[PDB]
Amino acid sequence: SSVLVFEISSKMKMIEKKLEANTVHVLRLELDQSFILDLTKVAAEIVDSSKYSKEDGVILEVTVSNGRDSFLLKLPTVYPNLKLYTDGKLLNPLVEQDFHFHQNLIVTVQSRLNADIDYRLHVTHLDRAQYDFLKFKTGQTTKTLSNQKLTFVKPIGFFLNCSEQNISQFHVTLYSEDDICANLITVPANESIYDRSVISDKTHNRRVLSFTKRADIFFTETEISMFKSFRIFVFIAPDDSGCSSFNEKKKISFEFKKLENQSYAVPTALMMIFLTTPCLLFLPIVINIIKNSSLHGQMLQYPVAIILPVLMHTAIEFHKWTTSTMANRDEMCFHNHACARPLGELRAWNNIITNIGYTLYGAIFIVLSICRRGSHVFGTYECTLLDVTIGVFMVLQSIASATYHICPSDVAFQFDTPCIQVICGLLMVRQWFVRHESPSPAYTNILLVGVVSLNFLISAFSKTSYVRFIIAVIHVIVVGSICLAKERSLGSEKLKTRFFIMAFSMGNFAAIVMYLTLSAFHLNQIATYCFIINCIMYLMYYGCMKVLHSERITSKAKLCGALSLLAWAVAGFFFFQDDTDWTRSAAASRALNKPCLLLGFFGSHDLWHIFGALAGLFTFIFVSFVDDDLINTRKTSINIF
Amino acid sequence: SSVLVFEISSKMKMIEKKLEANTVHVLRLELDQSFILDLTKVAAEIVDSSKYSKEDGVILEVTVSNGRDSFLLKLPTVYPNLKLYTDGKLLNPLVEQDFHFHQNLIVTVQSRLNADIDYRLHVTHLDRAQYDFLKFKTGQTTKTLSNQKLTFVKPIGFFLNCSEQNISQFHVTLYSEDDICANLITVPANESIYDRSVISDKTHNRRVLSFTKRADIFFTETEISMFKSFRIFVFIAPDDSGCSSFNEKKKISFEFKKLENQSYAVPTALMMIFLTTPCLLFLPIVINIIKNSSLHGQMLQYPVAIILPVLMHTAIEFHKWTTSTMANRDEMCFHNHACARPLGELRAWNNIITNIGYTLYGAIFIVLSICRRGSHVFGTYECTLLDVTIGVFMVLQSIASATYHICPSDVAFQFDTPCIQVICGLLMVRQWFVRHESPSPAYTNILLVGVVSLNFLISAFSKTSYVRFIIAVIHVIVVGSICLAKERSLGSEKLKTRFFIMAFSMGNFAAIVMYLTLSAFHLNQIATYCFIINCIMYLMYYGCMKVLHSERITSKAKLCGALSLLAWAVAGFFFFQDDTDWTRSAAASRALNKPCLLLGFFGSHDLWHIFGALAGLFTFIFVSFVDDDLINTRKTSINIF
Ligand SMILES: CCCCCCCC/C=C\CCCCCCCC(=O)O[C@@H](COC(=O)CCCCCCCCCCCCCCC)COP(=O)([O-])OCC[N+](C)(C)C
Ligand SMILES: CCCCCCCC/C=C\CCCCCCCC(=O)O[C@@H](COC(=O)CCCCCCCCCCCCCCC)COP(=O)([O-])OCC[N+](C)(C)C
Ligand SMILES: CC(C)CCC[C@@H](C)[C@H]1CC[C@H]2[C@@H]3CC=C4C[C@@H](O)CC[C@]4(C)[C@H]3CC[C@]12C
Ligand SMILES: CC(C)CCC[C@@H](C)[C@H]1CC[C@H]2[C@@H]3CC=C4C[C@@H](O)CC[C@]4(C)[C@H]3CC[C@]12C
Ligand SMILES: CC(C)CCC[C@@H](C)[C@H]1CC[C@H]2[C@@H]3CC=C4C[C@@H](O)CC[C@]4(C)[C@H]3CC[C@]12C
Ligand SMILES: CC(C)CCC[C@@H](C)[C@H]1CC[C@H]2[C@@H]3CC=C4C[C@@H](O)CC[C@]4(C)[C@H]3CC[C@]12C
Ligand SMILES: CC(C)CCC[C@@H](C)[C@H]1CC[C@H]2[C@@H]3CC=C4C[C@@H](O)CC[C@]4(C)[C@H]3CC[C@]12C
Ligand SMILES: CC(C)CCC[C@@H](C)[C@H]1CC[C@H]2[C@@H]3CC=C4C[C@@H](O)CC[C@]4(C)[C@H]3CC[C@]12C
Ligand SMILES: CC(C)CCC[C@@H](C)[C@H]1CC[C@H]2[C@@H]3CC=C4C[C@@H](O)CC[C@]4(C)[C@H]3CC[C@]12C
Ligand SMILES: CC(C)CCC[C@@H](C)[C@H]1CC[C@H]2[C@@H]3CC=C4C[C@@H](O)CC[C@]4(C)[C@H]3CC[C@]12C
Ligand SMILES: [Zn+2]
Ligand SMILES: [Zn+2]
């Protein structure tokens, strides 16, 4: 007797049986040709689980197999928080080639306990119109499934065949209104979501994406070429592990898109045209002077190690991106997929190509500074090398930001806007030293070390509850030191020094009060905002000093100052829309849903890139032009401030 | 009829049966109390597999279960290279708590083919004296198993219970003489080597180590505290995937050690005593002069960004080490485990603490240079800031090498000996400029950029077959440029310039010939050897120039030069023993078996650290002392070379 064979009718949805001690139940269901493409779920439940609360390990084992696919159920399934005494798994359906020939569904029940167990078997079939949904007609590139129910007892599965449907690139988006944790699972059609193929695998081809409100997966050309067929599953997650008592019903809307390679010619051309016409301010003055007109002692003492942090970070990020599998790239990278336009394997090509303004303006800065060089009695001190450094850091900002947008994740060094802080500090150094000497680029050494150290410190303490107090202390110390240096350099000449100190203290204290007690300022924005505000304040102080020392600001310099102020404000408005936070769960990071503002290509972050580049350009032009009224004044009669 | 039940005797080892089309075989074996702790293997074989060469997917499915554990067999199992029609898996044995009560072993056979299949079942029991071997008596800390057979049909498994055996720290070593690929697998005793627990796991607690000649796993205190029980398996690997036709027999010897926390007081004290007594050369001269005896203008223009590459690499490595699981740390890190002494979670504490000589000597360099400062008419030009830079890079070398030995892997930047190259270049700069001016530390900028770029370039092209030609081209270009600079600076004064150029060309060409056509020079050593050799050649040239210009080298400086030459040679001899190569397989990297040379604590690499630090110290002292015969000579009458 130990082995008991039962015959189960197809109509049966629920089976209740008692497993006598040391006995095995074998249940058979015959499958005809009506079971083709029928995705079946079999679940097992232990009746009266309270009696087995003192037993460790597996209390019931169930095996399910239809001949083509199989899995094992081990009850209870244990989770970090809970223990479930009911669980089930999906069986890959039989195909038309499988079919008086018939197929069998076999269920085996075993236990290690020397006591009778009551148990329940649930055989549920999924909606065969959510399976095989992914079939595209001629001229059809998008399909939508709206208001689909998701339950712990009824998951959702799709079959995708790219070879048969003529698909080279595929995108999938899920939308939900509730905050119920779910999972999006993808495997190649010949892989199992439950088992390992062999015991040495170390192959990562399975995607597991926890989500609440939004999930995105992109099948690139390379991945489709490798595998050609995929299965997609959605499950209710029993434990809110990657997101933050069940019986929830969760509604999900799907969006499936076939994609082709796209050359975003119109948006790129419009961006280049918009970025180019600002450069016409360089033509009438800087270039015309060039038209009208030891190097090794500065080439080997120029600080070139300032480029090392960005270049090493770029090498590290490229190494991390290239060795990752296709499946892991959708798990580890976080984009704003509502405004992400792909190009090849790159998920957000807009966020990368919109950094070209920094590259264009940095090279222009370098070339113009080198050419404009060339006298020692009249005018302010020239600033060739530090302007070259400002251009170099513009180029470094373009490289660092483009590298960041390949795969935005939580790493040791964020590196999306530190070069902007360096640029602001360098402009402050320029205006601080231009009337005493030729400004040196070793203040770049000190500034870069400070900026990178602050970036790392903010990153390391972000999870804690006192990181902003550390930032406020460092901010206070830096501003106090700068005020002390101003005092010592100029002396306590009432009008000049005292108002500078008071205004800088008030502005920085207002900022400190703001980001300490607002919570609308994210950690990734505080340092950049502080550097920009301090740079603008110092430039305004320099201009007011020029005015009240009875000097004249040229109308060209007033125009450039106004344009710089406007561009900085617009860039800051678009920067405020960032909303990036690595302290929340992956599902919360995936819930970002801001669409592209312009031409379906440009979003808030893309515009922040372009307008930050413009603000940098206009500020550079303003500081280049502001002291052009003193070109014939003698260096000994030039006022000092 | 479709379900057929068979009763199988315990004596049966082989079963041959025909699976008629659309039929299911259920085989039962009753288990008495004699099956306690009996690790059982069940394998399935498809007879005449040639008939199913045109069929895709799974042709036979087998489920095995003893009530407590279960698995699934799907035939054929496919591998990157081969397809196996015979495969089996291990079943976790029944325990004493499981036991007229009896247990059952159940085997189910199914197929999707509408044709009869012949198949064979093999039920093999493993050696129950290799299972439960890990039981330690009182006063016993090591156990050894010698000459154990490993076959594709008979794997090896061990059960480890740390709670019952009173184990806080455990080490396992495997030795083999043949090059047959195998796998070492470890899981917590409540985890499966075959299945995922739930479908959202992303938990890495399973170790898979490919090996040929040696494998090591270390159970730290933290891991044992989390899990308390583990199962260890060895398998023949069907495909030589992580290593480089079967029926091989592979012999393996095991070594199991209980470990306790150790304070290596005697070796550390001896190392500190050995490192300290060299410093007595500083006492009679440099410190006695201090006893007998703008800063902000150099503090803000000092290049501090030179510390950024090492500090950022250290932050990245610490982030990578801390977020890794216990299981992954044994998979991703490669030590010389024959000479690795643990401390806490650190696998090789000797390789980390032996870098303290660099830290001790760099701080001494900095302090002595700062204090010895302080005149402008007599003697050679003083070198305070560049000596401070040399000390700073000594400290950076200690940090970088200690960080490297936490987890030696194949990363973008190796960073075990670039700071040594920087130190050699800085000494060359010191001797190049000391008789013309005070040497500047911006040559550090150019030198550091070059060194880091060369390191990255060697790393990126290591897999290719022409990396050494790229290195040779860069070497030729650098040496030619240096010779040209020497010519231009000194002029073609026959005796001085021509012999310098000829000797440097000959030495560097000999080196280039060597590492191009020897293959005993590894990629990771070429640049370091070149920098050391060029530094020594330039110091010898400087000394010979002093001698042939009728100047005198003090006996103290001759002693320091001799000690520097001896220490560099000893350090190079120990450096030659490195044998690190990231182009080979992981098994080949794990086959390293060099034991500790001294006190069971110091190996070749540990001695390379100490003697490289000594060589640096002696070279620094020599260049500090060599021009002490010119202290009263006037700067205008000092010879130039
Ligand atoms: C470890 C964690 C990170 C730590 C660092 C974190 C911060 C990193 C940032 C910066 C690090 C460096 C800042 C400067 C340091 C003081 C230098 C100084 O005052 O002396 C110089 C002043 O020269 C200037 O002040 C020039 C302009 C500097 C602007 C750079 C900071 C911008 C403020 C950012 C806003 C706040 C930051 C936002 C915070 C959220 C020279 O003085 P002197 O006496 O004229 O020179 C002698 C010559 N003389 C006597 C003949 C004239
Ligand atoms: C992209 C891939 C990596 C590329 C970089 C890879 C290499 C990176 C390494 C180094 C990069 C920098 C090297 C120096 C470059 C030339 C500088 C020069 O000649 O001019 C200076 C010479 O001054 C010296 O030569 C000082 C000593 C320099 C030693 C540093 C290199 C050691 C050789 C390593 C052995 C070979 C390397 C081993 C290869 C396996 C100054 O010249 P001057 O004219 O006196 O100054 C003007 C003032 N005066 C006219 C008034 C006097
Ligand atoms: C020169 C200035 C404006 C900056 C460089 C921008 C130009 C040269 C870049 C930016 C966008 C680029 C294109 C982006 C997309 C396409 C389509 C596809 O086939 C890949 C390459 C191709 C054809 C690129 C060619 C080069 C390209 C046009
Ligand atoms: C400087 C300002 C005024 C204009 C600069 C010209 C820019 C906008 C031009 C120069 C080269 C051009 C590209 C040349 C080639 C490609 C690839 C092609 O498959 C689609 C068009 C596309 C993508 C063009 C886009 C526009 C482009 C980038
Ligand atoms: C921030 C940078 C880029 C822009 C600088 C803009 C310059 C041109 C602006 C900004 C602040 C301005 C000053 C603000 C207030 C006053 C007081 C009053 O007496 C009128 C002139 C005067 C003194 C302004 C002169 C022009 C001024 C200095
Ligand atoms: C020249 C710049 C850098 C200095 C001042 C920055 C200004 C322009 C920025 C910084 C903070 C920004 C504000 C932050 C919050 C709000 C509230 C909400 O309605 C969104 C926009 C709005 C109203 C922003 C408008 C622009 C803003 C005021
Ligand atoms: C001061 C100079 C010589 C360098 C510093 C070396 C000394 C201070 C270091 C190096 C080795 C270190 C010890 C290494 C091992 C032990 C045993 C264990 O309980 C952890 C800490 C402890 C107790 C450390 C204490 C500090 C220690 C003794
Ligand atoms: C400078 C030379 C001459 C001697 C320097 C003294 C060194 C060797 C001394 C100073 C502090 C000492 C350590 C102090 C504390 C510890 C932890 C203890 O559990 C074992 C001994 C151990 C690990 C000592 C090892 C030797 C030690 C590192
Ligand atoms: C490499 C550094 C650290 C050590 C330098 C060692 C010095 C003291 C050594 C190394 C090479 C030596 C020279 C080698 C050969 C000769 C030729 C002959 O006429 C004797 C003296 C003379 C000229 C030696 C003088 C001392 C010398 C300059
Ligand atoms: C002062 C230093 C840096 C310059 C010269 C380095 C010398 C001392 C080093 C570099 C290469 C080394 C040799 C490399 C290979 C061999 C062959 C084998 O039997 C091991 C040791 C031996 C014999 C080494 C002895 C020491 C050695 C000759
Ligand atoms: Zn950005
Ligand atoms: Zn080392």
PDB file of N, CA, C and O and ligand atoms in Angstrom, chain A residues 263 265 268-269 272-273 276, ligand 4:
ATOM      1  N   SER A 263      17.937  57.648 -35.465  1.00  0.00           N
ATOM      2  CA  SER A 263      18.865  58.765 -35.459  1.00  0.00           C
ATOM      3  C   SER A 263      18.091  60.037 -35.158  1.00  0.00           C
ATOM      4  O   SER A 263      17.355  60.545 -36.009  1.00  0.00           O
ATOM      5  N   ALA A 265      17.947  63.038 -35.445  1.00  0.00           N
ATOM      6  CA  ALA A 265      18.582  64.107 -36.206  1.00  0.00           C
ATOM      7  C   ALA A 265      17.978  65.469 -35.898  1.00  0.00           C
ATOM      8  O   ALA A 265      18.714  66.441 -35.720  1.00  0.00           O
ATOM      9  N   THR A 268      18.868  66.667 -32.230  1.00  0.00           N
ATOM     10  CA  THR A 268      20.296  66.939 -32.128  1.00  0.00           C
ATOM     11  C   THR A 268      20.681  68.192 -32.904  1.00  0.00           C
ATOM     12  O   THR A 268      21.471  69.010 -32.420  1.00  0.00           O
ATOM     13  N   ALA A 269      20.125  68.361 -34.106  1.00  0.00           N
ATOM     14  CA  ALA A 269      20.395  69.561 -34.885  1.00  0.00           C
ATOM     15  C   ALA A 269      19.864  70.805 -34.187  1.00  0.00           C
ATOM     16  O   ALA A 269      20.548  71.833 -34.141  1.00  0.00           O
ATOM     17  N   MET A 272      22.222  71.599 -31.280  1.00  0.00           N
ATOM     18  CA  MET A 272      23.468  72.196 -31.745  1.00  0.00           C
ATOM     19  C   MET A 272      23.276  73.630 -32.217  1.00  0.00           C
ATOM     20  O   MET A 272      24.133  74.482 -31.960  1.00  0.00           O
ATOM     21  N   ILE A 273      22.168  73.912 -32.905  1.00  0.00           N
ATOM     22  CA  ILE A 273      21.893  75.275 -33.345  1.00  0.00           C
ATOM     23  C   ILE A 273      21.681  76.189 -32.147  1.00  0.00           C
ATOM     24  O   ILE A 273      22.175  77.321 -32.116  1.00  0.00           O
ATOM     25  N   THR A 276      25.107  76.801 -30.468  1.00  0.00           N
ATOM     26  CA  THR A 276      26.082  77.526 -31.267  1.00  0.00           C
ATOM     27  C   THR A 276      25.901  79.038 -31.239  1.00  0.00           C
ATOM     28  O   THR A 276      26.895  79.759 -31.104  1.00  0.00           O
TER      29      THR A 276
HETATM   30  C1  LIG C   4      26.899  74.335 -35.656  1.00  0.00           C
HETATM   31  C2  LIG C   4      25.394  74.303 -35.910  1.00  0.00           C
HETATM   32  C3  LIG C   4      24.932  75.629 -36.509  1.00  0.00           C
HETATM   33  C4  LIG C   4      25.030  73.112 -36.798  1.00  0.00           C
HETATM   34  C5  LIG C   4      25.966  71.915 -36.666  1.00  0.00           C
HETATM   35  C6  LIG C   4      25.568  70.750 -37.561  1.00  0.00           C
HETATM   36  C7  LIG C   4      25.039  69.514 -36.826  1.00  0.00           C
HETATM   37  C8  LIG C   4      23.699  69.849 -36.186  1.00  0.00           C
HETATM   38  C9  LIG C   4      25.009  68.342 -37.819  1.00  0.00           C
HETATM   39  C10 LIG C   4      26.451  68.025 -38.308  1.00  0.00           C
HETATM   40  C11 LIG C   4      26.503  66.520 -38.618  1.00  0.00           C
HETATM   41  C12 LIG C   4      25.035  66.126 -38.594  1.00  0.00           C
HETATM   42  C13 LIG C   4      24.701  64.648 -38.587  1.00  0.00           C
HETATM   43  C14 LIG C   4      25.341  63.950 -39.777  1.00  0.00           C
HETATM   44  C15 LIG C   4      24.885  62.537 -39.853  1.00  0.00           C
HETATM   45  C16 LIG C   4      23.851  62.059 -39.165  1.00  0.00           C
HETATM   46  C17 LIG C   4      23.467  60.616 -39.327  1.00  0.00           C
HETATM   47  C18 LIG C   4      22.239  60.450 -40.215  1.00  0.00           C
HETATM   48  O1  LIG C   4      21.817  59.102 -40.267  1.00  0.00           O
HETATM   49  C19 LIG C   4      21.103  61.306 -39.691  1.00  0.00           C
HETATM   50  C20 LIG C   4      21.531  62.760 -39.513  1.00  0.00           C
HETATM   51  C21 LIG C   4      22.761  62.953 -38.602  1.00  0.00           C
HETATM   52  C22 LIG C   4      22.433  62.479 -37.179  1.00  0.00           C
HETATM   53  C23 LIG C   4      23.181  64.449 -38.616  1.00  0.00           C
HETATM   54  C24 LIG C   4      22.518  65.279 -37.510  1.00  0.00           C
HETATM   55  C25 LIG C   4      22.924  66.753 -37.521  1.00  0.00           C
HETATM   56  C26 LIG C   4      24.441  66.945 -37.438  1.00  0.00           C
HETATM   57  C27 LIG C   4      24.985  66.492 -36.079  1.00  0.00           C
END
